[PDB]
Amino acid sequence: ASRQLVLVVVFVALLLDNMLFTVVVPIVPTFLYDMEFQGTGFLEEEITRVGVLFASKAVMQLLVNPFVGPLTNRIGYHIPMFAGFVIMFLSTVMFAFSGTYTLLFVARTLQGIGSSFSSVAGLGMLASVYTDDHERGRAMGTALGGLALGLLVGAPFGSVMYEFVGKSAPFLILAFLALLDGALQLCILKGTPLFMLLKDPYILVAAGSICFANMGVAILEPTLPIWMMQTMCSPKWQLGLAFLPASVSYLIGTNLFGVLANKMGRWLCSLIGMLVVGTSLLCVPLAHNIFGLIGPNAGLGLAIGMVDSSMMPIMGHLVDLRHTSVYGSVYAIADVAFCMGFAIGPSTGGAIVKAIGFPWLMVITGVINIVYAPLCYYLRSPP
Amino acid sequence: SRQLVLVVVFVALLLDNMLFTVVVPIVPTFLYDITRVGVLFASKAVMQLLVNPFVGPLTNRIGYHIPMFAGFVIMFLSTVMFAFSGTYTLLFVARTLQGIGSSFSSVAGLGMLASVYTDDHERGRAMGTALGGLALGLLVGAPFGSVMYEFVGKSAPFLILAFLALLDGALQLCILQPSKVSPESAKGTPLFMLLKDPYILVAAGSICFANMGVAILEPTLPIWMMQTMCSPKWQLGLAFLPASVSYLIGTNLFGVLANKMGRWLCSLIGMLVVGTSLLCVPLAHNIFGLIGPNAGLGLAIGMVDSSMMPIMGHLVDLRHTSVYGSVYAIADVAFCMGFAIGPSTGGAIVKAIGFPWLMVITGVINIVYAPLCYYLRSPPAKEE
Ligand SMILES: COC(=O)[C@H]1[C@H]2C[C@@H]3c4[nH]c5cc(OC)ccc5c4CCN3C[C@H]2C[C@@H](OC(=O)c2cc(OC)c(OC)c(OC)c2)[C@@H]1OC
Ligand SMILES: C[C@H](N)Cc1ccccc1
């Protein structure tokens, strides 16, 4: 038993969860196309079902999140964290062996439940082990940065491994990685609830801005590979690689603007990020080849990095100024924004792409971001 | 012969707008020996706005030479009337005459530049350099009048402008040859049909909104500076210098980049930047804090102007017949509406609701209107 082991376990758990999220982007549409049969343009019939499939994780996470915390209070943190590995292993095995649309729905729902349990239990365990109030910041920083490395090699790893080795390869590799995390875990050893924190407009504005800045990438996942196969005729292994700018630019932007945003005001960073997101989403559906997406996607990643680096300290300051704040207060509010975005984006986006064209959806999202952008002026100098 | 026409329009806009800004140092102090003075300055925008619809249709039947020569004559008469008049009612009329001359010169010159230059990119370059000349006139005019009123007298700068206008008229007579009435063979679209085109309306609205955003901020800033910052008198003019300098740089630099980057993207980014700059202007607590937002405002306005001037001729070439008088009359009306509305009602609006809410409203309007420039990406052509 040691303090570093819990850090390594939480690191591997969050990495596996985000990797399993991001590796299902270029495999589900390709798998659904290959079973039926560049190719044909029948994917518009199934775009609604593919959109509804991606929202299952967000909906299940939003449902099961309120019940986790009292459960961790009652029976501790180690037992609920172990359930996350079991559910993630079951989901990753069912993904590899699934052949029909029904099983992938169950896989996504199970992944949502396991992700919620693993995240809450791991953060609680890290808070419990470290009790110095200054090393806790470094530990939380490393654990949350584990999401970035997990995000970076997740999306262009299923696409590359799909066309060369097989469809059961990446899921089996993730399963073997998840099994190693459980082996390490075996050798181990209050104020202002969330519904009151969403009753003041200063926090609702920030949460909505985070959600609307992340919806641009939330609704770009299920609809971009189908668009690529329909119009640009790219090979099946470049669909994942078309998302690499959205990760690398996001990491660069979050580093630079976490360093630099305090000098020029956080609200200005948020406003410029939302405007850049809107312009990039507008410029996305004009490309006629794969190389035309290296610019708009990079801008989208940079702008989302701007918003996500300038908004979290604002929420922390707002919670400290007017309420009683704990270690996980900012995390809970941010999680609802991401989950709400991933649950509302794809489900409506599929219906919009069926009813009207794909470019109109991007235009709508860009207009929404631009219109919401002026409202960040409220966040300066809160009382 | 196509290069020298740019020189004629360059000098014509340089001299006409120079008289626009030279008056401001010299008239408010001279009458003393606020609303009365402000309504004087807005007479040019109002009268030039009305004469514009009667200039566009006239250009088909007369040509682009007679209106420009008439504008030169009216400008010379206005500057001579300024140089000798010594009362309020004799200074109102000269401003009205200068407005008429400015309307003639702007519409005729931009139409002639559009007709001489046919390629879209090469026309964008010329319109960029002409707007650069206008910006240089605006920048140079005020200190010129202030220095030669402090040191030499009142009647000196107007007489010097009269001599320069005579030289411009000599150059015009040598180059343009304004001696006969030449009717254009093409019968252009009527001015009421062009207003039913959504794209022309979008372009005119973008120009009007950006210019209104600057035109409200121009007269209503010194009062706020006095009431909050407590700054001396000599910093008032220096506050707005970055806007003029950045506008000159932007209008000389973005005419080249608008074609490469895309007109709609340049206009969108300009409107967003002008909205953010106006939104951040009311937050400064000293003179040094207004350097950034004013420069951003000038750059954004240069972006919008250089992007949306050639777009009018492009739309008229794509959809309607190739006669460029009426569309640039519409563009000049969009230019002049902001200055017509700003000085007259800015004090009333500020006393009614407050300066920061005015800035917030203008910025939010620009930001919301910014998405509508996407519609100018590729307008459909007319049926063959
Ligand atoms: C699924 O992706 C995620 O799940 C993460 C990202 C969401 C989003 C995203 N998805 C993509 C999927 C792609 O596939 C093709 C490609 C590109 C992207 C991008 C680019 C843009 N990107 C941003 C990522 C943000 C991550 O969240 C945090 O970094 C974070 C940090 C904190 O510390 C301050 C928190 O505490 C307050 C916190 O609270 C909940 C969250 C978030 O969750 C961990
Ligand atoms: C030429 C612009 N419509 C007016 C302006 C622009 C920039 C600065 C000051 C004034």
Side-chain angles (χ1 to χ4, degrees), chain B residues 150-286:
Chain B
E150 278 231 9
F151 276 12
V152 155
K154 152 194 191 29
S155 67
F158 303 112
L159 292 199
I160 280 190
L161 257 286
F163 183 60
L164 286 208
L166 256 289
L167 259 286
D168 161 53
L171 167 144
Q172 197 147 345
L173 243 179
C174 161
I175 281 195
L176 261 50
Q177 196 71 14
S179 147
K180 103 187 55 181
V181 158
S182 100
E184 289 209 61
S185 198
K187 230 183 177 181
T189 43
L191 190 59
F192 86 105
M193 226 151 261
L194 290 184
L195 270 296
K196 298 190 172 180
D197 224 322
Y199 305 93
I200 301 205
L201 294 195
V202 174
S206 202
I207 303 179
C208 197
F209 284 161
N211 281 253
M212 196 156 344
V214 68
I216 275 175
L217 167 58
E218 217 177 355
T220 198
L221 190 63
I223 299 163
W224 191 65
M225 265 189 222
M226 269 147 223
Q227 291 177 9
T228 281
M229 305 181 158
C230 296
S231 81
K233 196 161 182 180
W234 65 267
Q235 294 177 4
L236 303 201
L238 271 48
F240 214 60
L241 210 65
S244 320
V245 169
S246 91
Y247 178 82
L248 182 141
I249 276 155
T251 203
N252 258 36
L253 165 139
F254 265 118
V256 172
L257 290 184
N259 320 336
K260 313 193 174 179
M261 150 171 86
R263 310 226 192 241
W264 62 273
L265 192 38
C266 193
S267 165
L268 205 159
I269 288 144
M271 282 208 118
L272 296 181
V273 171
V274 74
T276 311
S277 318
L278 279 203
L279 246 178
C280 301
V281 159
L283 282 168
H285 42 67
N286 51 0

Side-chain angles (χ1 to χ4, degrees), chain A residues 267-268 271-272 275 279 282-283 285-286 359 363 367 370-371 373-374 377 380, chain B residues 264-265 268-269 272 276 279-280 282-283 356 360 364 367-368 370-371 374 377:
Chain A
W267 65 273
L268 199 32
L271 206 161
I272 297 163
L275 295 181
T279 315
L282 267 174
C283 279
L286 274 36
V363 157
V367 165
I370 270 171
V371 172
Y377 196 128
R380 100 212 180 290
Chain B
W264 62 273
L265 192 38
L268 205 159
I269 288 144
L272 296 181
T276 311
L279 246 178
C280 301
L283 282 168
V360 155
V364 161
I367 272 174
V368 176
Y374 189 92
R377 209 189 78 241

Side-chain angles (χ1 to χ4, degrees), chain B residues 15-29:
Chain B
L15 268 42
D16 283 357
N17 285 254
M18 209 180 228
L19 220 52
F20 191 28
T21 318
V22 54
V23 68
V24 172
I26 217 161
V27 157
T29 292

